[PDB]
A = this chain, B = another copy of it.
Amino acid sequence: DPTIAAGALIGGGLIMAGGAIGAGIGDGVAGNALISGVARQPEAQGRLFTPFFITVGLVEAAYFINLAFMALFVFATPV
């Protein structure tokens, strides 16, 4: 068995590694356009949160789906 437990920890660690790369860069890249948009015009700050939180919602969906599959590999290992 140990082998399968080591494979689960490495496989789960890959899933959360790729999750944080997708999330941290995705939110930085989306938030760069929020900061530049508010800088471009402050009165648009209220409207710009809609395009931003749609984008952040899509980026975080990849993160929390990866969090669920890491938790499944770790706590409910499929073999």
Binding site for B on A (CB under 8 A): 1-42, 44-45, 47-48, 50-52, 54-56, 58-63, 65-67, 69-70, 73-75, 77-79
Report the bound CA distance from A63 to B10 in whole Å: 18
A79 to chain B, nearest CB (A): 4
A26 to chain B, nearest CB (A): 3
Q: Are A73 and B73 in contact (CB under 8 A)?
A: no
Contacting residues, chain B, for A9 (C-beta < 8 A): 4, 7-8, 10-12, 73, 77-79
Partner of A22, one of B4, B24, B40, B51: B24
Contacting residues, chain B, for A77 (C-beta < 8 A): 9, 79
